[PDB]
């Protein structure tokens, strides 16, 4: 009755989504083969797995997801592992030739022959669903197919469906730690498409996640599997109000009507707590008053942005576990008292709080330690204007002397489209400055 | 999907090609009889990139052996792993190029290349989805340089959107064994810059330095030098055949390395390289590998990388390792040595991680770096050419086969033109 369809496009989305679908199976008690462990006995609460899975009629559960990519190696890993029996075989769409860090290839040359197959599958997925809340898309912007096919999908979905809310969990490049050499180009191009076609976008850069594992979890050599588990917990907490009863249930539709003051401003960054390992998480009581203090710690923000440089527009808090409503209210009063956190003038009240009864679920072989309480943050602040400013500066350095341009011009893209993307970010910067000033 | 076809020409290229297929076969567990005897299922998932299926289930490489003299092909077929090659893919001349670029490109090469174009056409149309071509040849010999570079133009004319890759061995002034080397080297560079998508340069002088100084082995031979090149050759396509954290094919390397269309010459290197008596004293860790990676003495090229500035650089890691350590290591070297990196491009090093190392090694790295120091080879080669061409020495052989002195002037001007535009970015400021 309340369903969400998750789209995984690009290698970044697949691997992040790979850890997500391991967590949801654990949280609902579904084996990787798809069958429920204990037959059909009368102990099952329906409309709990209906958010993410679909009943096959007799036995197993089929997840509501589609895997989209232009390169075979990442998809074939899933089709060969132990999760081969879970997904629908014709929902893992794969191509032949990769985009190879080129935006023009994934949006003008190869993306045109794959979008038809993807949209056809989405139609079948939505037809089975009856109370579709919205869509979830995962993609790293700093890549070819992630930005190319990602832009095309939002453009096609915005006209095919219309008013359905879409949430984008994108991964922007870190300030100075980055893999590719030309990703500032196709990141700017990708930004223009998702600005006018998404309702909520979440900042999920990689450098901030490295710092969290170094300080809190005390992990000095983390691989990508460690990071993807952290994002997986955030998705679980956000959606936990759609399938578990609580004191203050908050749906998907009542997120982007409370975090979006103006239609253009929908870029916000997330935070999670407590994130602490099983060898020192067992000295502390982890009170609600102190876990909510760690949420506003600027070092715990999962985006490389300093919130102290900008005002807070609105914040969203989602507690799960055994929190008490008064204890939350007492903590919020202390936060407003603190002088280091300042809100915007025209937003007197700025907290939206939800409480759920189901505690977080720990994955065996993981790094986190399972606890009673957890809080997830989705905060919109004016400090986010700096991440686009530094990306614009990097673009200006290389586009001044036309580096790497001939790769884009030769694949059908016109020379001028680099210019139009510039004013879009420039206009976006002006809006953030305009909003932040007081009356 | 995205398979590649291999072509080797000349005596130098054939020896390079012969050793390369020995490395690949052992990596995928292929016996000299063409039967698979590997251990892990990963050894067979991506075998279609280099191999074809035939009746009986045996595998044959899709390699074309092309030359003017049957003497060299009789030796390579007689070597171990020589029975894998298709006996119908052996196409050879009967006269010989005689180290004459005119002979290999106008008189004897032209009349023979018709036949070899059919077999390479057959191999290209048979594949599911072509990725690109790779060529191994030398720029000092006639058949390698002349008929080697003509095949590139014909193939590029028919397959424009593919990727052309060449592993080119240029001659060095120290170890020089052919007097007319400067002549046919200049004519090859002119033709190579127009069509080749990616080219890598190897120096026999540099390979000698690596063996004698680093490996500390007393008697290097041509089998040893061919072994070093072959290991680096498989590293480029290593991630195209095994799963990894950050998959990166040939096209991705092309996008991230070439800023301007005419600047596509690279120098390569391999790590780690440890002596037999000193391999129990080193510790294999990511900080250890990167220090040997950027070592000037480890380059397979005679150019000194500290005499210029790196435009772009790339490092391909093989083995199970943490991504953060790789990322923090690449940033540190770029900040500690900011003087040797060009400043109008941020984070000019690309990192890739693959989860399957070479056989016998827990960790290995292939380095492909675009640096402005390459201009030294072109300058010294041009210096040899201009002194020898002013007196018209050894010119009647080239002018005796329909090629006039106008073409020589065009090649010399083009080669100097490449250097001038290649050097101006070194002093370019933002």
């Amino acid at each position: 009755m309340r369903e969400v369809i998750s789209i995984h496009v690009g290698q970044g989305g697949i691997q992040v989504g790979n850890a997500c679908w391991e967590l949801f199976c654990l949280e609902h008690g579904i084996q990787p083969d798809g069958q429920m462990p204990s037959d059909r006995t009368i102990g099952g609460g329906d409309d709990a797995f209906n958010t993410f899975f679909s009943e096959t009629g007799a036995g197993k559960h089929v997840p509501r997801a589609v895997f989209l990519d232009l390169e075979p190696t990442v998809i074939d890993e899933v089709r060969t592992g132990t999760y081969r029996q879970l997904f629908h075989p014709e929902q893992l769409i794969s191509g032949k030739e990769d985009a190879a860090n080129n935006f023009a290839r994934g949006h003008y040359t190869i993306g045109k022959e794959i979008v038809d197959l993807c949209l056809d599958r989405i139609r079948k997925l939505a037809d089975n669903c009856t109370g579709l809340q919205g869509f979830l898309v995962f993609n790293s912007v700093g890549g070819g197919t992630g930005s190319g096919l990602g832009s095309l999908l939002l453009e096609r979905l915005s006209v095919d469906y219309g008013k359905k809310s879409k949430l984008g969990f994108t991964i922007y490049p870190s300030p100075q730690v980055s893999t590719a050499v030309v990703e500032p180009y196709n990141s700017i191009l990708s930004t223009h498409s998702l600005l006018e076609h998404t309702d909520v976008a979440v900042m999920l850069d990689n450098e901030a996640i490295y710092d969290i594992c170094r300080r809190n979890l005390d992990i000095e050599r983390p691989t990508y599997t460690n990071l993807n588990r952290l994002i997986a917990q955030v998705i679980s907490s956000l959606t936990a109000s759609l399938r578990f009863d609580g004191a203050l249930n908050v749906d998907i539709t009542e997120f982007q009507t409370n975090l979006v003051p103006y239609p253009r401003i929908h870029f916000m960054l997330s935070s999670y707590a407590p994130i602490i390992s099983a060898e020192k998480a067992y000295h502390e009581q982890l009170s609600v008053a102190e876990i909510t203090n760690s949420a506003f710690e600027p070092a715990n923000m999962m985006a490389k942005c300093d919130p102290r440089h900008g005002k807070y527009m609105a914040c969203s808090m989602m507690y799960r576990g055994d929190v008490v409503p008064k204890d939350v209210n007492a903590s919020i009063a202390t936060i407003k008292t603190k002088r280091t956190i300042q809100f915007v003038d025209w937003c007197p009240t700025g907290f939206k709080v939800g409480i759920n009864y189901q505690p977080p679920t720990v994955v065996p072989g993981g790094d986190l330690a399972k606890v009673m309480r957890a809080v997830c943050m989705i905060s919109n602040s004016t400090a986010i204007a700096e991440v686009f400013s530094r990306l614009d500066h990097k673009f200006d350095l290389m586009y001044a002397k036309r580096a790497f341009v001939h790769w884009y011009v030769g694949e059908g893209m016109e020379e001028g489209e680099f210019s139009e993307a510039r004013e879009d970010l420039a206009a976006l910067e002006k809006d953030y400055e305009e909003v932040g000033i007081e009356t | 999907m995205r398979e590649i076809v291999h072509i080797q020409g000349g005596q130098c290229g054939n020896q390079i090609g012969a050793k390369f297929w020995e490395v690949i076969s052992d990596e995928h567990g292929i016996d000299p009889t063409g039967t698979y005897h590997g251990d892990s299922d990963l050894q067979l998932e991506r075998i279609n990139v280099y191999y074809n299926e035939a009746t009986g289930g045996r595998y044959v490489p899709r390699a074309i052996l092309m030359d003017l003299e049957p003497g060299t092909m009789d030796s390579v077929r007689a070597g171990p792993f020589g029975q894998l090659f298709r006996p119908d893919n052996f196409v050879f001349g009967q006269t010989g190029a005689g180290n004459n670029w005119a002979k290999g490109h106008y008189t004897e090469g032209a009349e023979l290349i018709d036949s070899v174009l059919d077999v390479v056409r057959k191999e290209a149309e048979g594949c599911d989805c072509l990725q690109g071509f790779q060529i191994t040849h030398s720029l000092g010999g006639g058949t390698g340089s002349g008929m080697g570079t003509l095949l590139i133009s014909k193939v590029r004319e028919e397959y424009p959107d593919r990727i052309m890759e060449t592993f080119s061995v240029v001659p060095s002034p120290k170890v020089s064994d052919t007097v007319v080397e400067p002549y046919n080297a200049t004519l090859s560079v002119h033709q190579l810059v127009e069509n080749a998508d990616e080219c890598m340069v190897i120096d026999n002088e540099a390979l000698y330095d690596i063996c004698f100084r680093t490996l500390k082995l007393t008697t290097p031979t041509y089998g040893d030098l061919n072994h070093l090149v072959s290991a680096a050759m498989s590293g480029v396509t290593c991630c195209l055949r095994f799963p990894g954290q950050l998959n990166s094919d040939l096209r991705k390397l092309a996008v991230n390395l070439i800023p301007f269309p005419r600047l596509h010459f690279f120098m390569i290197g391999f790590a780690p390289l440890t002596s037999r008596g000193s391999q129990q004293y080193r510790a294999l860790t990511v900080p250890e590998l990167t220090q040997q990676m950027f070592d000037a003495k480890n380059m397979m090229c005679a150019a000194d990388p500290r005499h210029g500035r790196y435009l772009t650089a790339s490092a391909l890691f093989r083995g199970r390792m943490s991504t953060k350590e790789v990322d923090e290591q690449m940033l540190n070297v770029q900040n500690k040595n900011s003087s040797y990196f060009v400043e109008w491009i941020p984070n000019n090093i690309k990192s890739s991680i693959c989860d399957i190392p070479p056989k016998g090694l827990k960790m290995a790295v292939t380095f492909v770096g675009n640096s402005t120091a390459i201009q030294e080879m072109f300058k010294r080669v041009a210096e040899q050419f201009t002194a020898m061409f002013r007196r018209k020495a050894f010119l009647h052989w080239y002018t005796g086969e329909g090629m006039d002195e106008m073409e020589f002037t065009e090649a010399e001007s083009n080669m100097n033109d490449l250097v001038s535009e290649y050097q101006q970015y070194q002093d370019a400021t933002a």
């Binding site: 790979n18 691989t223 | 199970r320």
Partner: peptide
Amino acid sequence: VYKVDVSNAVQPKDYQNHTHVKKPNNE
């Protein structure tokens, strides 16, 4: 990395018993 990290991390266990939250006298 995927095979050793994600594919074989889970076992038949951890799925067996899964239960979540349900919906004077004197005188």
